[model samples]
Target: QPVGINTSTTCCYRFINKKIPKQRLESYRRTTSSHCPREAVIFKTKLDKEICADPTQKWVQDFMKHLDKKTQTPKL
Candidate 1:
């Protein structure tokens, strides 16, 4: 089962500081402050596992960029 955010029961209290390779991740979800105490980037791995990552981390931003590029078509 995918370790997705259980908005009704779970909140991101902590996050991983380690940088994860974009190759290992399939997609990600950003937590909302209104729903959770803290904001986090929830990444889904190829194995269907979820990892909470700190959004402020540089690597996280890079991964988000890669994921976005893969998901959205470039205008130019």
Candidate 2:
């Protein structure tokens, strides 16, 4: 079950759109939902705060790299 955070959907969407394949995206979502159950609610409310707090966080770049590595789709 996902945390009751509205922005979870948005975050998942953004992550997926960054070229993570459907399967991996789903896995990531599920993992996040499970691991960050409590934080998810706060994430929803403080999405901007979270993003702003780590504008150049390594995870963002790492995720993008992971997505790129996993995807077979051509870059646009």
Candidate 3:
């Protein structure tokens, strides 16, 4: 069964803050069992051509927002 966000969820935040590119994190999201689309339909379905297009979709929007917030900083 899928477990909702776990305590280690913030690990990604740390990795991202370490100067890792957002695309790298997104790549992991695509490959990781936790966030990867389970079916072909979900993989192909996109809310928009750009990131954070679907604000209502918390998962997608939050990821994008987090990256944006991180990138604005001088370090980490």
Candidate 4:
């Protein structure tokens, strides 16, 4: 049950933001419900690649809250 943003009907889509970095990646693990490959969650993939959240993980909304917490833009 995908619960993230930009939710796709199939596992062939992403639900996380792109402009962000891997540091924003919340977690990494395997999946069963979503077709999305097992990998870094909420940001990238298992290969340390960029992807997206399905729409099952409840953490989706949590990420939104994290957005509001940003006091300033981080520097690279």
- Identify the candidate with maximal TM-score: 1
Worst lDDT run of 10 residues, candidate 4, spans 9-18
Residue-level lDDT of model 1, residues 1-76, one tens digit each, is: 3598554635566767665877888788777788677777788788888888877857787777777765557798
TM-scores for every predicted model: 0.70, 0.22, 0.21, 0.26
State in Å the error of residue 35, model 3.
30
Per-residue lDDT tens digits of candidate 4, residues 1-76?
A: 4567564433434455434443555443334554546533444445676455555555554654554465578899
Model 2 spans with C-alpha error above 4 angstroms:
1-54, 70-76
Local error of candidate 2 at 45, Å? 20
Question: What value of lDDT does candidate 3 attain over all alpha carbons?
Answer: 0.31
Q: Clash number for every model?
A: 0, 0, 0, 8
* Candidate no. 2 TM-score: 0.22
Clashing pairs in 3: none
Name the lDDT value of residue 42 in candidate 2: 13
Candidate 2, residue 6: how far the Cα is off, in Å: 26
Error of 2 at 15 (Å): 14
Total colliding residue pairs, candidate 3? 0
Candidate 2 collision pairs: none
